[PDB]
Amino acid sequence: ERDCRVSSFRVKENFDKARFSGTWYAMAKKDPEGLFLQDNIVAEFSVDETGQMSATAKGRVRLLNNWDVCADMVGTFTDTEDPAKFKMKYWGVASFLQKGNDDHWIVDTDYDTYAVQYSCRLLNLDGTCADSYSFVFSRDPNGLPPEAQKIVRQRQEELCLARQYRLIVHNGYCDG
Amino acid sequence: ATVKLTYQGEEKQVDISKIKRVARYGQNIYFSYDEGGGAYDYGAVSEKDAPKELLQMLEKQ
Ligand SMILES: O=C(O)c1ccccc1NC(=O)N1CCC(c2ccccc2C(F)(F)F)CC1
Ligand SMILES: [Zn+2]
Ligand SMILES: [Zn+2]
Ligand SMILES: [Zn+2]
């Protein structure tokens, strides 16, 4: 928790792409600088015959104070020496035109209840992160059991993001 | 009169006259016919490729 260099962060041991697959609901988020999905954020992870992992991400986007839309993005993950650290190329589909390439770290998960994700986009010279985003994912769209909640809080502190997350809803805006 | 623009991911003939919502978002301009703002009812074009009549509508605010 006191060493805040991105290099010193533990990630998920022996991360298993296949057990991670399926639907993950974002329950809380820590925003990066700039534009970002707002809420109703749902990610679907998949593993193909090759073992290459993929995901879709859907959520609400606020174009104007009076104009909310939904946006879909697809991401393709390139493996690293670390089974939990990926490089994710992503792009919007249909008429969502945002795209990019981010580090994508699975900081921890039990695959059945919760996951903590993390992406440092820009590092300070001293190795701490100057621009990051992070999701708390749950298999349950509405909440986490208290056991999971305790672990998540620990991981947020380890990321030096304690108290920097916002809870985000799932109210059907993009899936009904 | 109309312009070739992508709308809900499909190439459409868009009458810019009838656009009721327009916004700059990142490097792109998003637009919709719909006053009700249906969640997926929108198209988009890059700022650099945007027809001038669309930019005019955007900038008049
Ligand atoms: O990145 C931008 O420039 C941007 C601009 C406007 C609006 C949203 C934006 N970006 C995001 O919201 N996100 C969160 C989702 C993330 C993604 C995409 C596809 C598959 C999985 C994931 C995963 F990382 F969440 F798993 C991509 C970055
Ligand atoms: Zn551990
Ligand atoms: Zn529940
Ligand atoms: Zn739903």
Numbering used by the authors:
A (entry chain A): 1 to 176
B (entry chain B): 1 to 61
Passage from the reporting paper:
In this study, we present an ON-switch system based on human retinol binding protein 4 (hRBP4) and the orally available small molecule A1120. The most promising candidate was human retinol binding protein 4 (hRBP4), which transports retinol in plasma. Lipocalins possess a β-barrel fold with an internal hydrophobic ligand-binding pocket, which can bind a range of different hydrophobic small molecules, depending on the shape and biochemical property of the binding pocket. We present ON-switches in which the affinity between the human lipocalin retinol binding protein 4 (hRBP4) and its engineered binders is increased up to 550-fold upon addition of the small molecule drug A1120.
To investigate the molecular mechanism of the ON-switch, the crystal structure of the hRBP4-A1120-RS3 complex was solved at 1.8-Å resolution (data collection and refinement statistics are summarized in SI Appendix). X-ray crystallography revealed that RS3 binds to hRBP4 at the entrance of the ligand-binding pocket. More precisely, the engineered binder interacts with the two loop regions (shown in yellow in Fig. 4A) that have been described to be switched upon binding of A1120 (31, 32), confirming our hypothesis that these A1120-induced conformational changes enable the construction of a drug-dependent ON-switch. That is, those loop regions adopt similar conformations in the two A1120-loaded structures but are structurally distinct from the retinol-bound state. The observation that the presence of RS3 induces minor structural deviations in those loops of around 1.5 to 2 Å (A1120-bound vs. A1120+RS3-bound hRBP4) is not surprising since these loops also interact with the engineered binder. Notably, comparison of those switching loop regions in the retinol-bound vs. either of the two A1120-bound structures revealed RMSD values of around 3.3 to 3.9 Å, despite only minor differences (∼0.4 Å) between the overall structures. Furthermore, an overlay of the RS3-bound hRBP4/A1120 complex with the retinol-bound hRBP4 structure shows that in the retinol-bound state loop 2 of hRBP4 would sterically clash with residues 23 and 25 of RS3, further supporting the hypothesis that the binder recognizes the A1120-induced conformation of hRBP4. In contrast, the small molecule A1120 used in our lipocalin-based ON-switch is almost completely hidden in the ligand-binding pocket of hRBP4. More broadly, this demonstrates that in molecular ON-switches the small molecule does not need to be solvent exposed for efficient switching behavior, provided that a conformational switch is triggered in the protein which enables allosteric recognition.
